[PDB]
Amino acid sequence: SDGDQCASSPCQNGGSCKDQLQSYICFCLPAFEGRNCETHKDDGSA
Ligand SMILES: *[C@@H]1O[C@@H](C)[C@@H](O)[C@@H](O)[C@@H]1O
């Protein structure tokens, strides 16, 4: 009962949305980045 910021799935790139205290959190893979998982980390050779 601390606000629901996971109704329209704010996460992206198949990110997992989880309702947390105050705000929320997007659980994604280690190869992804960004607040809403919208930055595919494709480097490999970098
Ligand atoms: C939610 O967590 C993320 C990290 C991925 O494993 C998703 O497939 C899962 O549903």
Query: What CATH number has the domain bearing residue 26?
Result: 2.10.25.10
Cα–Cα distance, 43 to 33 (Å, whole number)? 12
Mutational test site, ligand 1, from 16, 36, 37, max ligand atoms within 8 Å of CB: 16
Cα–Cα distance, 45 to 14 (Å, whole number)? 24
Q: What's the distance, Cα to Cα, between the start and end of the chain in Å?
A: 44
User: For the chain, how many structural domains are there in total?
Assistant: 1
Distance 14 CA to ligand 1 centre (A): 7
Strands (E), the chain: 16-19, 24-27, 32-33, 39-40
Structural domain boundaries, residue 9: 1-46
Q: Is the dihedral of CA 21, 1, 11, 26 positive or negative?
A: positive
Q: Pick from 24, 25, 29: which is nearest to 14 by CA? A: 29
**Helix, strand, coil share of the chain (percent; to 5):** 0, 25, 75
9-44 per-residue burial string, b: 16 or more CB within 10 A, e: under 16 = eebbbebebeeeeeebebebeeebeeeebeeeeeee
Distance 28 CA to ligand 1 centre (A): 6
User: Can you name the residues that pair with 39 across neighbouring β-strands?
Assistant: 33
**R_g of the chain computed on alpha carbons:** 12
